[PDB]
Amino acid sequence: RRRRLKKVEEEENAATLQLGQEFQLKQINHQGEEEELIALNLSEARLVIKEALVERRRAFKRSETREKELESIDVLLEQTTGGNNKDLKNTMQYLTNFSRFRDQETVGAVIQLLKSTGLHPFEVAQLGSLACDTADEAKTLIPSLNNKISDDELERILKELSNLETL
Amino acid sequence: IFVYQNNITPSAMKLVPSIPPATIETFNEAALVVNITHHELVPKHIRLSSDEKRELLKRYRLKESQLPRIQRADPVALYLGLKRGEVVKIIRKSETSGRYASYRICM
Amino acid sequence: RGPNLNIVLTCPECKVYPPKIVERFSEGDVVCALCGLVLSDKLVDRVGEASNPLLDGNNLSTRIGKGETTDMRFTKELNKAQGKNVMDKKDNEVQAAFAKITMLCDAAELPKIVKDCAKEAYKLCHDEKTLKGKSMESIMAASI
Amino acid sequence: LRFGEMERDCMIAHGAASFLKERLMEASDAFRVHICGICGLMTVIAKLNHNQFECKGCDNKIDIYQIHIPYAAKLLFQELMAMNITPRLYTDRSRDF
Amino acid sequence: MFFIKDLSLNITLHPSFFGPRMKQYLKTKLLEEVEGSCTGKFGYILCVLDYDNIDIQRGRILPTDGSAEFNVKYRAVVFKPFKGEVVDGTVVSCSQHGFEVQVGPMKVFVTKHLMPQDLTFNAGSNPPSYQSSEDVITIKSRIRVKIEGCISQVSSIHAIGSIKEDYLGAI
Amino acid sequence: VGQQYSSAPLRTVKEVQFGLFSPEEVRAISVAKIRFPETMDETQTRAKIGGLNDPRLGSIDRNLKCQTCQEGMNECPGHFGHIDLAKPVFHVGFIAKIKKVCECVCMHCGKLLLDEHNELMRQALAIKDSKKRFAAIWTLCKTKMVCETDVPSEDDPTQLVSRGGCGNTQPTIRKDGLKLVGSWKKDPELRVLSTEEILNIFKHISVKDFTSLGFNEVFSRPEWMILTCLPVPPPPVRPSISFNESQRGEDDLTFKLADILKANISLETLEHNGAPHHAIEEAESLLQFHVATYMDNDIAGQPQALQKSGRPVKSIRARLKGKEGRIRGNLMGKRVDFSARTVISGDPNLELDQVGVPKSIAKTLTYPEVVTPYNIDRLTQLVRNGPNEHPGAKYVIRDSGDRIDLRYSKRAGDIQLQYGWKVERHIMDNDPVLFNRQPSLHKMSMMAHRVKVIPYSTFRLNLSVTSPYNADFDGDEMNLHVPQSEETRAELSQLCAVPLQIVSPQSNKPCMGIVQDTLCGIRKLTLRDTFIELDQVLNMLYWVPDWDGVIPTPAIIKPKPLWSGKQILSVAIPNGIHLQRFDEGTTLLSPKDNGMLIIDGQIIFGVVEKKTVGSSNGGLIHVVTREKGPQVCAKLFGNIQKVVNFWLLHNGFSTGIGDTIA
Amino acid sequence: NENFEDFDVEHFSDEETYEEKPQFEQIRRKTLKEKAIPKDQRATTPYMTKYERARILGTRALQISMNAPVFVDLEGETDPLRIAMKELAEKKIPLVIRRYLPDGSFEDWSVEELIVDL
Amino acid sequence: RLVKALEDIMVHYDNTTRNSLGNVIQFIYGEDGMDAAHIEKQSLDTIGGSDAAFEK
Amino acid sequence: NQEDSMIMNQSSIDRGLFRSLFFRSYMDQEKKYGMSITETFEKPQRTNTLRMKHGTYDKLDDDGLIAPGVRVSGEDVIIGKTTPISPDEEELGQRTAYHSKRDASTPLRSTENGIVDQVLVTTNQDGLKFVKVRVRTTKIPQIGDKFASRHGQKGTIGITYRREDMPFTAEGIVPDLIINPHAIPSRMTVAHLIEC
Amino acid sequence: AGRAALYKEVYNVIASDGSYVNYRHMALLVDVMTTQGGLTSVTRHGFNRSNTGALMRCSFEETVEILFEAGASAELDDCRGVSENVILGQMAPIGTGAFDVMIDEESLVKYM
Amino acid sequence: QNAQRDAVTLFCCLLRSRLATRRVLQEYRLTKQAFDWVLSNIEAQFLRSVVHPGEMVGVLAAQSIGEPATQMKVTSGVPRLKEILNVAKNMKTPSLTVY
Ligand SMILES: [Mg+2]
Ligand SMILES: [Zn+2]
Ligand SMILES: [Zn+2]
Ligand SMILES: [Zn+2]
Ligand SMILES: [Zn+2]
């Protein structure tokens, strides 16, 4: 098998694509086959959480303006979640305080312009997460973008993204 | 099979291992006067095929090392000319079952 | 000052300080005498050698002797190696002084309390600035 | 009372296994000790009030298990560690049966 | 940041919940100690996907307790921080040691050694905060922090952040 | 109080991997460094920092916490230390093994003398297991006295190929006490081989070289045998005993570690401040001797370490080997709780599977029965009864693990029992307990009985089971063990019970039987001469508990209503049991009245003796336990012993001097 | 101490005598799904063994002891062991047994289908 | 000594008599798959008697 | 009386058959460890003594030694000894400046009882005070006590019968002790019969 | 034939004084003595040399030497023996512990 | 299946010897329900007589052999058992039986 012991390895670094011994590009499903690592930006994860919550609402039932959506997700969280639910409420408040994309159409647009870059899920998730407008700012924010992607390509990706947001 | 009279010199002994698959077996006349299989204590031995050995290892869900062993110097092993890695099936008389079947791999 | 490293046997239900604590040695528990709640179970009530660190201090040394199968030259070499040790020279000389005091009191057939008191007096009265010039016999007689 | 060798062997002969376990764990010394996942040693610093485990030599705080062993076995393992012999305890198999 | 992962949990179901509808009890007990729970292996597990079918194996009766040890395999969204990752956030508390910025489920501490020297602390103003010659850092204010390092325990993850890098701070 | 909760997963040990320690791992896992041989501080009241009893390594006092893990006595496992030795030393239990490696690899360049260019090396590499392969390599390379830098080619011995190696001649290495010396070949120069040279040679050994020697490249390298960083066991390994709660006598390991620190300090001072090579060799020999006697005092040809009192130092090997070691004296056989031991006396009015437990032993021994809705009232009454009067209870364990002693608790009022709490009640009747007689040579002497509480000071048990126990009441003692859980009590009652073990797997005959005078009386009950009158027949029928209630019709109707003994004994035998046996000269008519015939649960003819109810195959016991079951055979044991004991009570039996004279 | 001539053998003390005489695969691999043998080629005995019976009564008695929902109609029985025996007698116990083979593979068996003959 | 030598041997669920390593000692327990507790001494009527007795 | 047991007449036991006195002596000394590290015979009290045993201390005197004739019971102290320790500590919770002494008493055995017969104060070769306390009790023959013949016919008491249950001759002589017949011929002990 | 002669000799010793033992125990003993192709003695240098784990080899005799020879060779103990689980206190794979029990769901919902 | 028939052939021989046609119809004289009950009982007893797996037959065998050694020309008994278990190149009374 494997002679497991604390060998020599580099420390965990997000700039050198060393996300740990488990956070690899190829992950193993419960079915046993390999898949690409599923990494999300802020807006995409906010959606995935929101349809997760309404899917739990649909499962339990069978057996726009920021403030009204906030009170809707608050009543959804208070009726759906049980004890120790302050953390999910606080992180979903973080997501809706820093979300840039509202509907699933713009999220799909972001993922289809970002899937053609041929990059790791880490950098496309960060580029969907960071509200960047300068190529040098994107270079100094994500160190892995150095010697990986062109500056004008970053410029058109960021300007298309900056076109994409509403509210 | 080479059957000598008194002894074998070491200088001829060291060349007994020869080109495979040809094998050289040496037996003494005095050590082969009486057939040991005709004794009552020695039971019936049957050398098995590779398919039979694989079926034995699969049906009893064993490994090569999980079988009982017989050394490659036993007089019955030299009587059957056994080599390493083959399993002999042994049929013996049982006082609680009449007949009993065991298996031994030559090591 | 420093770490506390202290465990107090306080009952968490009575909240009375100091609590009445009963050590049930036969049943091996520590219980509160008010409510009967146990506090510490599996209590510990031979294998080493006795050494009181007041008669000779915190000296921890063992000698080398003949075993079942023993070469004499190895024993002589180990004894000579133990002889040329410079850290315990003060310990070696105070042990020699204790041996001379107990031999000299033992040839006087005095009780063991005399020897113990003389040894502790010699230990607590050693390495003193005011007592350095007197001969060792006077020190031993005064301690005795 | 001396639940000695031969008593244990007769308990083996009866096939009573949980009786043997509770004569060897609950009736004498059921010691809970934490071990590392990387190294098999029980040298794990466990602040259970702070709920923090830290294993020196592996620098991991996330791969610590807890096991129940007799204190005699724990003392045997620790004195073996003093003997420059390492009885590494792993919670998972490594080779097929 | 946010990931979608496949995790496995060993749940010790008590024999008291061995009813005919024990699957619902097992699911509720699973979501009681998963939502908002922090794990150093996988980060802060926030929410669980795929509720209609969760792979629940055959539960193991413990050899001395009688409780059933189930190996429940689920899919969940997690927030595992990494050192070298830049995140936005809002400051929730401040002190002369520095400020706590909330990113997702995590309180990242930016210490007084990790901002440029223009920022100075003051407690006379309400609230006690940090001010500089160009910007101020108060409670419930947007900021951007770079994670210099994170420490992961068995049940707690704490990260250290900085704003000394250029093009950081308030947006 | 139990043990506090932990968030670590609870797993079982599935594999145990042995090996050796690297010095780096010892220096990494250690929490402190030992610098002083002393243990106490200068005030003789606190643990010395950096000494042998540093609080970071652990604690051995109930009021003291550990400095590292911040926990008490029951939780702290103790933490190890490290000593950085000035010079490397050999491990005493590996020296000959090191000598074997000294006959395997080169002493100059640290390489194997013979590589794969030899047929004998290639066939030695074909050996699968480590021990036989290493033994073959050592026995075949011990005659090689040269490094063999240039060898003939394997395919043909016509050209010479230069393999690895320096070509220097290998000196003959022999052991002298605790050191190794080497004599070079005279074309002899004998010199002492230093330990650091052996360490450098072992470091020069490549991975494949000790892989062929069988050493694992991850867990046990040969270079880790050379001790240069000594581990320090925690104070729980080496506790300080108290003689009258005022003395601070330390363990023998503390003495040996203090001597090791003294030798290391002396060696360091001699190295730093300069010394002749005689002094350096003597100091390193003293350090090696101290390490060896710390690891093993019993060395052949070597003096042992002695204590102040004149006894030898109880080393690690002495504490591990022998009878009273850790393995044979604390792991295979250990003292247990919830047990009792006392002398024994027979009680023929008990059942076969029943043992008579004294009332004080019943009050002392405890069994935790949890509170259920099915036994709320019984457990509440047992709690309210208190630990003074049997039946009663001694402890109440709440669901958080806290335990209330019921004495020193009556003044605070009664405790309402909730579901899930435990009550450590006294052992009542029909409580299965395992019962033991040492030596316990076979499994028929570890047997599960049922408690019957009796008001005297002896274990009382049925007379039939004295044959598997190998017990007679001439002062013999037996032991009792109480199960502590429902699973354990249930498997003890369903596996080790008395009726389940009537037939012995030793010789497929019943190990139990009607023996001793109950065997004698059953001969005098079922003779031809014996007839029993009405006033005795009625009591002999009433003594059977499973008597069917109908009076058997007398074998003598008139002139006087008399029952025969065979007819009365046949009531104890259940129906449907048929046995046939013939002795010599035995027919369907029986003048000697030997043999035995049992038809439809009735004795037809034949006296009952050792051949019928004794511990023999083909008897009544074996037939009943193989045709009807174990419980019916145990009830048969009870019924026959009751009937025969009552009849011999009202009939009498003796022996005398006149019985032995012709 | 004591001085008795009543000879009491020291037990587990054979080391005296020890010191007297010291001188003289193919079908299953890794953790795949071939370990779980399906029901149609189970090669084990369909009769529940006495050890299996003992642990089933022990485990059911412990569950009933820790307040498990009892699947049978009691006649006032209070002891957990007798209730477990009643549950197994009329086959209302919902536990299964993994008969382990030496190679690591296993066969599952419901105690409802296991024939209880002893 | 005998108990320590025969310590780890047990009949597995395939009715083979194996030790801790899984090594086969007997391919079926007692060469018949039979517990010792259910053994009785029985007479074989065919092996005894004469040929005429067998025919009768 | 099976397996070498003996049936004993309970009335004979009540009249003193094999009833016996049991004397156990306890020795207790002092010794001087130095200047002030010593130990002393005095009655300990709850106010200023550490690690008190749970047994009753009222049986002692002013000098800490129990008067002879006083009944003692299970694990009750008969010799009271105390020794000074370091004051102002922090252990077990119940530690204060009052607890300047700790208990060094020697209690009675947890099962043994009886009557104190003789308490003896003297000095050894060292001149230090030491005491010897003799506890005297009765050992009534009950079930389990091993009785022997003069021919190796040992055995415990099986049971005790009173006179009205235990058999009797025509002269009214109820035996003192009933032994099993089967113990005689297996051992071939004829001298028991001839001695009788 | 060596195993047969061994069984006959042990039977002669057992039934020399008339004591009788069932066949299967004798067969198990002689099969263990002849399971390695040679007459493996029941001594310290007999059955204790087979690689069955360090803890059962050190439980009988020479604990320290066996632990040395295991630590040098880095022997991996499979922990399937009796004495390994006895030392570790976990349930041995014997008797009631020779299997594992799970809880069912199809029958559990089938009952009610 | 071959090993199973090999295991049960002696008991099948006993069953054929006892439950022959002549002995049943002449000596045993059963009826049809009686014979069916006999077949069912023999099958049930043989099924309950199989060794229960998980039984530690090794230590049981060791106890069953070590116990009769306690109870006790050529040497026999304890010294001969010592010479058997500790196999030795020499023995007390080496003997040969020539037919
Ligand atoms: Mg006796
Ligand atoms: Zn309290
Ligand atoms: Zn580790
Ligand atoms: Zn600690
Ligand atoms: Zn060389």
Swiss-Prot record, chain A:
GO cellular component: cytoplasm; nucleus; P-body; RNA polymerase II, core complex; RPB4-RPB7 complex
GO terms assigned for molecular function: nucleotide binding; translation initiation factor binding
Subcellular location(s) per record: Nucleus; Cytoplasm; Cytoplasm, P-body
Organism domain of life: Eukaryota
InterPro entries xrefs: HRDC-like_sf, RNA_pol_Rpb4/RPC9_core, Rpb4-like, Rpb4/RPC9, Rpb4/RPC9_sf
An annotated GO BP: transcription initiation at RNA polymerase II promoter
Annotated keywords: Acetylation, Cytoplasm, DNA-directed RNA polymerase, mRNA processing, Nucleus, Phosphoprotein, Transcription
Keyword Zinc-finger found: no
Protein family according to the UniProt entry: Belongs to the eukaryotic RPB4 RNA polymerase subunit family.
Subunit annotation: Component of the RNA polymerase II (Pol II) complex consisting of 12 subunits. RPB4 and RPB7 form a dissociable subcomplex associated with the 10-subunit Pol II core complex. In exponentially proliferating cells, only approximately 20 % of the Pol II complexes contain the RPB4-RPB7 subcomplex. In starving cells, that enter stationary phase, RPB4-RPB7 is associated with Pol II in a stoechiometric manner. The RPB4-RPB7 subcomplex probably associates with TFG1. Interacts with LSM2 and PAT1.
Protein name: DNA-directed RNA polymerase II subunit RPB4
Species classification: Eukaryota, Fungi, Dikarya, Ascomycota, Saccharomycotina
Gene: RPB4
From Swiss-Prot, chain B:
Domain of life per record: Eukaryota
Entry annotated with the keyword Lipid metabolism: no
Residues in coiled coil: none
GO function terms (MF aspect): DNA binding; DNA-directed RNA polymerase activity
GO cellular component, one term: RNA polymerase III complex
Compartments (UniProt record): Nucleus
UniProt keyword terms in alphabetical order: DNA-binding, DNA-directed RNA polymerase, Nucleus, Ribosome biogenesis, Transcription
GO BP term (any one): transcription initiation at RNA polymerase III promoter
Oligomeric and partner information: Component of the RNA polymerase I (Pol I), RNA polymerase II (Pol II) and RNA polymerase III (Pol III) complexes. Component of the RNA polymerase I (Pol I) complex consisting of 14 subunits: RPA135, RPA190, RPC40, RPA14, RPB5, RPO26, RPA43, RPB8, RPA12, RPB10, RPC19, RPC10, RPA49 and RPA34. The complex is composed of a horseshoe-shaped core containing ten subunits (RPA135, RPA190, RPB5, RPO26, RPB8, RPB10, RPC10, RPA12, RPC19 and RPC40) where RPA135 and RPA190 form the DNA-binding cleft.
Function in brief: DNA-dependent RNA polymerases catalyze the transcription of DNA into RNA using the four ribonucleoside triphosphates as substrates. Common component of RNA polymerases I, II and III which synthesize ribosomal RNA precursors, mRNA precursors and many functional non-coding RNAs, and small RNAs, such as 5S rRNA and tRNAs, respectively. Pol II is the central component of the basal RNA polymerase II transcription machinery. RNA polymerase complexes are composed of mobile elements that move relative to each other.
Curated annotation (Swiss-Prot), chain C:
Residues of the full protein shown: 14 to 176 of 345
Family recorded in the similarity comment: Belongs to the TFIIB family.
Job description of the protein: General factor that plays a major role in the activation of eukaryotic genes transcribed by RNA polymerase II.
Residue positions binding Zn(2+): 11, 14, 32, 35
Name of protein: Transcription initiation factor IIB
Subunit description: Associates with TFIID-IIA (DA complex) to form TFIID-IIA-IIB (DAB-complex) which is then recognized by polymerase II.
Subcellular location: Nucleus
Note: Present with 6750 molecules/cell in log phase SD medium.
Domain of life: Eukaryota
Taxonomic source organism: Saccharomyces cerevisiae (strain ATCC 204508 / S288c) (Baker's yeast)
UniProtKB/Swiss-Prot annotation, chain G:
Chain residue ranges for the region called Leucine-zipper: 74-95
Positions where Phosphoserine occurs in the chain: 13
Keyword set, alphabetical order: Cytoplasm, DNA-directed RNA polymerase, Nucleus, Phosphoprotein, Ribosome biogenesis, Transcription
One GO-annotated biological process of the protein: transcription elongation by RNA polymerase I
Comp. bias regions, Basic and acidic residues: 9-24
GO annotation, cellular component aspect: cytoplasm; nucleoplasm; nucleus; RNA polymerase I complex; RNA polymerase II, core complex; RNA polymerase III complex
Localisation: Cytoplasm; Nucleus
UniProt-recorded Gene Ontology molecular function terms: DNA binding; DNA-directed RNA polymerase activity
Record-linked Pfam families: RNA_pol_Rpb6
Recorded superkingdom: Eukaryota
UniProt record similarity statement: Belongs to the archaeal Rpo6/eukaryotic RPB6 RNA polymerase subunit family.
Function: DNA-dependent RNA polymerases catalyze the transcription of DNA into RNA using the four ribonucleoside triphosphates as substrates. Common component of RNA polymerases I, II and III which synthesize ribosomal RNA precursors, mRNA precursors and many functional non-coding RNAs, and small RNAs, such as 5S rRNA and tRNAs, respectively. Pol II is the central component of the basal RNA polymerase II transcription machinery. RNA polymerases are composed of mobile elements that move relative to each other.
Name of the protein described by the UniProt record: DNA-directed RNA polymerases I, II, and III subunit RPABC2
Species the sequence originates in: Saccharomyces cerevisiae (strain ATCC 204508 / S288c)
